[PDB]
Design a protein around this ligand. Structure first.
Ligand SMILES: [Ca+2]
Lengths: 301, 159, 156, 300
């Protein structure tokens, strides 16, 4: 009875993975499917063990796996091939559950060559591999759903939406294609309340976008002093360089912000750092007509 | 339960013999709508007998199949209709439309006889079923010739 | 080119499944001329799906076959028509001529299901096709019983 | 010597799972056992490699796996069979570690047919599969232990107990048998402080119990405006339907809350929605004798 045991040990193994992705996936419909699958993995094992005497894999079991597999391919839409696994934790656990499910097919395809196995066993096995894959896809579509609202709510100053989004798992470090993160948008607009709640959840305090800007750059550029302090208290790079090479001191010296120049210099800004234009913070202060900033940089030596 | 019904996914002599018999009884149900009242009742009884044979074969002999009385009934019909068929040396299949249906049924009955014979060789169950199928192919042949003769005789009256 | 056409001279599981499906679609084409307008359209969609399954099987899985939407479509028809058939313990096959045609189609669909199952065992291609064929035999059975019911109801 | 290699690769594989469930299981005694198992999985590998020359799996090793396996089966009581795996993460990681442990038995049972392997290897292996199962059971018993305490503390208004519970892993979305969650109990009673920390952990803002009530329903039913405000700020369903089908506006109009009817209407309450008795918010305001609510809904 050697081949049927390895299947039982893989059915039992897959059930451990399915139960794991169940406790991770934060959506109700995915967990409903996964729990039915778990209770069906009992029947599927009982089918292989008894050879058809006890409980058997019914066609209504396979049919339900397809009913949901069609309902999910509608929300997904076009399914790109050659996609890398491990999108998000709820999705990634489902990807691993899928890979084990496909191994159970390989264990079933072997054992069927050594003992008659009801065809519905491999049919449900093949449908389980498919429906687990739709589970992971939907999980990532909804993770990108929340993250596109967190970047939106961080822009519109939605102190309450950002709360509901970060409480529902919206990735606080969600990076746009521009490289802009919700922490970037909060410092840009100037909603100090969101800057803290983002950093509390574990925001990347010095994320770089395409331009190379950090949240401290945007906070110094747009005259939001309150954000410059809390960013620097959290270890923001005070002399970070964007593509142009300008530091927060350069940008704070350009736009005529003395109280921000004073704070950035206090945590260790470089008066001698030069952008790619050779101009120092002492230069960009003189270039823009801001005098009281240049002397703070001049007397800083 | 509705989505599932009954599903068969293997090739073994029992499954092949029952499928051919299912094909045979389905074709008889089609062909019984082209014959007269007398032949229709005969063909329906044959369908019931095929169900008994399938019950025996599908149960691997645990369920009782046809009885020897059914085989005697087929033999009496063959004896009764052989007198009417003044022996014809050769006749092209499908002399009439109704005769063509019966010839198709006879070929399926012959194939079913071969499949059930394979089952009997493999398991030793189904001797009476094989005898019934042999007599059934002979009887189906006789009925086609009788239909041709009776339809031809009415054609000679209209001229 | 005319004299030649298409010639098949080998016996393998792939060839047998496609040939039986050709028989199934030919018999469905015969039977669709005996049913009403609704059932005729249902049988024609089934014929296209049988053609898709043959395309998948004949290409050894390189060409995409039926989709899960087609299987859901069969299931909805089975669910819709199972409600109408108040369960009858047994009825002899071929209650009417149209019902007899559908019973012939059902037997060929069951045999084709067996052949396609052989292909799935041998090559691992045709899982969705096998599911469609199982549901198709059930639907053909249900349609035959419904035809019987309608002729009996007009007799009442 | 090819089969003894596959066992080593599975011992090493199980050790990865054991160390993972160790860093997950938040109790000291479970981690205590798991750490010995890891250090013992080394010896178990060295036993299979050396065939008994170097370190060997001792009976005292198997003996300790049973001493702890009895101490845990006592706290559990009756262990129902055919129970679905993956209860909670600490348990689920242990369930997967168990499934790998049982695979190591199959790799050992194979290799033992090809090279002499000390019986204590499979004995410790078989006992390891069992003791990991008790770990998962205990993890869920203690996870369900906190969840009945979080549901309990949310009832009594224990602002301090909820702090220790949510910090120690008590599931904020823990559903009682009634279908009631701690957010339901906090809005029901009216302990506003707990409502905040619960939603902060990620409470299901519109979970439905058996009756179909949502946290916004219970908050509107018992006249806690402060709780109705914060629920709606998080996107609570302002026209949610229970088994009765009454929306929050229905319930707020039934029990005489003008300031809640007005605020629910600002976020999109339905003046004309009907319950299963056909009575609308204009009806139920008249039915219970509240007139100033009926006029605001009539002018809507
Ligand atoms: Ca044929």
């Amino acid at each position: 009875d050697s081949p049927v045991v390895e299947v039982q040990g893989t059915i039992d193994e897959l059930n451990s993975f399915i139960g794991y992705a169940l406790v991770l996936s934060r959506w109700d419909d995915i967990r409903n499917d996964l729990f039915r699958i778990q209770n069906d993995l009992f029947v599927l094992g009982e089918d292989v063990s008894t050879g058809g005497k006890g409980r058997t894999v019914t066609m209504d079991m396979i049919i339900y796996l397809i009913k949901r597999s069609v309902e999910m391919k509608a929300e997904i839409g076009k399914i790109e091939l050659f996609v890398v696994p491990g999108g998000s934790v709820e999705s990634a656990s489902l990807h691993m559950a899928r890979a084990v499910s496909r191994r159970l097919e390989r264990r079933i395809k072997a054992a069927s060559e050594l003992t008659e196995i009801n065809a519905n066993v491999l049919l449900y096995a093949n449908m389980l591999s498919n429906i687990l894959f739709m589970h992971a896809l939907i999980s990532n579509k909804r993770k990108e759903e929340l993250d596109k609202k967190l970047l939106e709510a961080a822009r519109a100053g939605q102190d309450d939406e950002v709360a509901a989004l970060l409480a529902k798992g919206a990735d606080v470090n969600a990076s746009d294609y521009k490289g802009t993160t919700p922490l970037h948008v909060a410092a840009w607009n100037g909603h100090l309340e969101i800057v803290d709640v983002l950093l509390a959840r574990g925001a990347d305090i010095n994320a770089s976008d395409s331009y190379g800007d950090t949240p401290l750059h945007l906070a110094a550029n747009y005259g939001h002093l309150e954000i410059v302090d809390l960013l620097l208290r959290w270890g923001a790079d005070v002399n970070a360089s964007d593509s142009s090479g300008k530091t927060p001191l350069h940008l704070a010296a350009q736009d005529g912000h003395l109280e921000i120049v004073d704070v950035l210099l206090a945590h260790g800004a470089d008066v001698n750092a030069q952008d790619k234009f050779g101009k120092t913070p002492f230069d960009l202060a003189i270039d823009n007509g801001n005098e009281d900033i240049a002397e703070v940089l001049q007397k800083a030596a | 339960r509705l989505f599932g019904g009954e599903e068969v996914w293997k090739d073994d002599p029992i499954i092949e013999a029952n499928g051919t018999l299912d094909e045979l009884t389905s074709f008889i149900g089609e062909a019984k709508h082209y014959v007269d009242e007398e032949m229709k009742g005969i063909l329906e009884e044959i369908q019931n007998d095929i169900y008994k044979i399938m019950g025996e074969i599908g149960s691997k002999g645990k369920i009782e199949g046809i009885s020897e009385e059914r085989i005697k009934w087929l033999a009496g019909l063959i004896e009764r209709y052989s007198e009417m068929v003044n022996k014809l040396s050769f006749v092209l299949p499908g002399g009439t439309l109704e005769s063509a249906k019966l010839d198709v049924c006879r070929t399926i009955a012959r194939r079913a006889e071969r499949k059930v014979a394979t089952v009997l060789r493999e398991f030793g169950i189904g001797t009476l079923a094989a005898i019934y199928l042999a007599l059934l192919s002979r009887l189906l042949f006789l009925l086609a010739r009788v239909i041709e003769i009776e339809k031809n005789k009415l054609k000679e009256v209209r001229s």
